[PDB]
Amino acid sequence: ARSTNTFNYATYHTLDEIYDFMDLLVAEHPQLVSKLQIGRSYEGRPIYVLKFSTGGSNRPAIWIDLGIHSREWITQATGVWFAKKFTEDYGQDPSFTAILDSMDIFLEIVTNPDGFAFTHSQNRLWRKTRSVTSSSLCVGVDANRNWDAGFGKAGASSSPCSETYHGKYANSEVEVKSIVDFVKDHGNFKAFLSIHSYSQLLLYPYGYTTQSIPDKTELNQVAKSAVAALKSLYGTSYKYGSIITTIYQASGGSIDWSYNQGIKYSFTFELRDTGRYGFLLPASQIIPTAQETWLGVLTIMEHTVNN
Numbered sequence: 001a002r003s004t005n006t007f008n009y010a011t012y013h014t015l016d017e018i019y020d021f022m023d024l025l026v027a028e029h030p031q032l033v034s035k036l037q038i039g040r041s042y043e044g045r046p047i048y049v050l051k052f053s054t055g056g057s058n059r060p061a062i063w064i065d066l067g068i069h070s071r072e073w074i075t076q077a078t079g080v081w082f083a084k085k086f087t088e089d090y091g092q093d094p095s096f097t098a099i100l101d102s103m104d105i106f107l108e109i110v111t112n113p114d115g116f117a118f119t120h121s122q123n124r125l126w127r128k129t130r131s132v133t134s135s136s137l138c139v140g141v142d143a144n145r146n147w148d149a150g151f152g153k154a155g156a157s158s159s160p161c162s163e164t165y166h167g168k169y170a171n172s173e174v175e176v177k178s179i180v181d182f183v184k185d186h187g188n189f190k191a192f193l194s195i196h197s198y199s200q201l202l203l204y205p206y207g208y209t210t211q212s213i214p215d216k217t218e219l220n221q222v223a224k225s226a227v228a229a230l231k232s233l234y235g236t237s238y239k240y241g242s243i244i245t246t247i248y249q250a251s252g253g254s255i256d257w258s259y260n261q262g263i264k265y266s267f268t269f270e271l272r273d274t275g276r277y278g279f280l281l282p283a284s285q286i287i288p289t290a291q292e293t294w295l296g297v298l299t300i301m302e303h304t305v306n307n
């Protein structure tokens, strides 16, 4: 509450708490972090990304987004813990220090703020945005099916009332377009990771097409290494592979889009658990989850700096 050191990372928080946390962090490490506003949600809430950088101009960057599906609380929670961790580990962990001395990291903790607020206010299991319209009383779009990557193809629904509704057109949701314009405008992203829950999977493209990506052998080996690291702390077992062979066909996904933009290291994580608690993972699992996920992400970042 008064400092990032007194914030309670072992519990779930509301939107205002997370937004205040951002300002506290910026206030404590002004030389390392900054808060940028890249848009406003459908209901007018600011959409914030924290930029972590030791300098330079347009250094190659890493994008990390959490919370695009609002009910996946473990992700925003992990997001806050990563933010703090970056500031703690810089100058202490040689590997992480190396990364930040040459690359910037952009972290979007609450990608879909309107749905997150709704999960606190009215329906804890809501996952879509809260955009509305005309030919329906149904609200919202599955923001992870609204990207311009196989948009509208099989693996998304065209019914507005569906939980997997893709939206009227690619990028119709301001929460997605805001990320699209910012990444396009920056043009120097090297890695793009989107964090979700649950299932314990580490996936790479594609989900909209059976076509294999050209960098399959490399991403697969990176995935295997990342999974090996993450398991190292608590024994948590992940499976990895391309989206479509691992799960099923899914269209309009963020990582299919990022990869098609030339961002080679595009991965999606589906965090704990495997169904015992599902979306309502206990607060007592937050820190362990965060800690082990960090080892998996740090592994991908290292490969990134080096390649």
Ligand SMILES: [Zn+2]
Pocket (backbone or CB within 6 Å): 068, 069, 072, 195, 196, 197
């Ligand atoms: Zn999700």
